[PDB]
């Protein structure tokens with residue numbers, strides 16, 4: 101219709117609006133605040149590291165923790181506050197859940213960094229549900245959870261370890277390099293980067309034990325420089341679990357935190373939980389199967405959980421092919437439709453073939469859908485009927501022409 105009502109507020113619909121009822125109905129579910137949920141367990145262990153295991157020169161900073169911020173944010177909060185350019189590909193309608201042109205469900209917990217800095221906070225964690233439009237497989241879900249951490253330092257704290265530290269400065273006017281921002285001194289950046297990497301290495305040792313294999317990968321974000329991803333070697337592959345870096349000075353200065361340099365990080369809770377607990381499919385976080393959920397009810401949050409694998413059920417594979425409409429088709433629109441109709445019956449969707457017809461000039465797409473339930477065997481009848489409903493919905497709602 102013309103308006104969406106969410107959390108007591110009204111959003112007029114426009115050309116950017118792309119929310120689905122299934123996604124909207126999970127706003128407020130807050131799995132990260134559900135006692136004994138694995139995502140809540142990871143949040144509680146990370147909070148304990150900051151409460152008891154982080155120490156600086158001036159003692160432990162008191163990190164305040166915000167786990168109940170509304171996910172409805174403006175484009176300015178999600179993008180402009182973090183220096184994301186207007187033409188950046190992360191803003192595309194295909195990849196984000198937009199209530200309208202002005203409001204969206206946050207795609208990251210970094211959407212709250214400016215506001216919390218603007219409130220005068222120098223040490224904080226944000227934990228919350230985040231929303232992205234993407235592909236369907238065992239590692240991707242429309243809703244996932246992140247833990248954000250921000251720590252700011254004055255020159256007095258950063259240089260407290262040396263007698264003439266008061267003569268050193270956070271800022272200078274030089275040039276941006278791979279190692280630093282144009283207005284940062286190398287003296288400050290090396291100390292901030294070291295504290296960021298040391299804190300994260302220690303936290304991973306406090307979540308996983310002492311035999312973990314991690315590596316730092318240099319990368320880019322518009323809101324940090326220098327920036328890194330931490331990867332964990334798991335099942336023979338290097339997997340990214342977080343993004344981090346030295347906060348861009350324009351962001352810190354814009355929020356009113358003058359004379360501070362900071363580090364920031366964003367952890368993917370499902371990515372970490374899937375490695376820490378050997379959870380094979382991200383749909384298990386949303387299931388109500390006691391075989392999965394009972395395993396995370398522990399008396400001490402430091403108990404090493406040894407998750408017991410669930411039985412794996414057979415799959416039913418079906419292909420769906422259709423001619424795309426002349427304009428405006430996006431693969432994410434089809435993936436959203438599969439999530440709406442197929443739901444948690446669908447393990448993955450792969451685009452396996454595309455071609456252009458010589459006479460009509462139309463593009464054909466062929467998608468392979470793997471139906472596999474996490475809790476039971478699927479009947480051939482339920483998959484056949486659901487697959488047919490998906491074909492009808494694609495023609496009616498996406499304007500495709502069936503090749504069926």
Ligand SMILES: N[C@@H](Cc1ccccc1)C(=O)O
Pocket residue numbers: 207208209210321324342343344345364365366367
């Ligand atoms: N917001 C980034 C992670 C990040 C957070 C903080 C600093 C740098 C990177 C993401 O979602 O990938």
